[PDB]
Amino acid sequence: MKIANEFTVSVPIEDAWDLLTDLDQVVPLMPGARLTGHDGDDVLGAVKVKVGPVTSEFAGKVHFVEQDREHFRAVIDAKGKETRGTGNAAATVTAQLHEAGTSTRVTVDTDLKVVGKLAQFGSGMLQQVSEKLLGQFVDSLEAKLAG
Template structure:
């Protein structure tokens, strides 16, 4: 599945580039996302997604695999898995920055692969939700840049200490506030709610069935 999104931020291209290529700085700007640590050059994180009464949590990792400052082009490889086994997704994300007067236009091309129940959303629904997510991200990025926050400010996740072996896991130095879950029904809008509700009902039924089975097993002992 291929997605294309564009947005513009009121910041010089070099400022926008420095921020967008700092995953520590931009990850918290994504709705529902939170960094949890590092594994070598990869960033570890999680995202909470709410569909009606059901909240799912995805854990995953992302890494910058290509950066070309002269061309203002970056490639991110990311993958994630639902903690309840509803499915998994992986993506190759290519971002390109172009000067637009005093502002910067950002084009994000995503090649996404979705497996499991997540695929039931369909490409049309995912594309529309992706666009609205990107709009929220762009607004948060705009606010961050307008506030003059530097990409080199204290980070949520810290790099490995000098002398630490390559690939060593590095956790965030202290607990951070849990983000609000990404509300898919609220984000999708009325036009898509009816298409999402059957999936939400199926997931809820699965959760209830799982809890019932655990309850019965405990009382059989």
């Protein structure tokens, strides 16, 4: 399924690129996510996803497929296995940065596959979930930049 998001960050595009190409900075800002380690250059982490009373936690790895600085575009592959029971999630996330003067506009297009309990939520629901979670990521990221 396809999920599409957009947000703006209060730093110029060069700064935004350095922050968003740094998974050690991005992963801890994501709601429910934690960095657990590293595997080569890749980041190991886990994310607890809560939709109403349904909770799934996925543990796995985040890896850059591509970093195109000349176009300010990055492709990230994230995969995780459910920690209880049988399930897994996999995302290919394409992030594109755009100049906005003192700020930077970020478009995020995700190809998401979910297997198991969380697959009961369709793309309309998961698009709405993604918007809520992205709002928290932006809030946490702006709180960090202020400090």
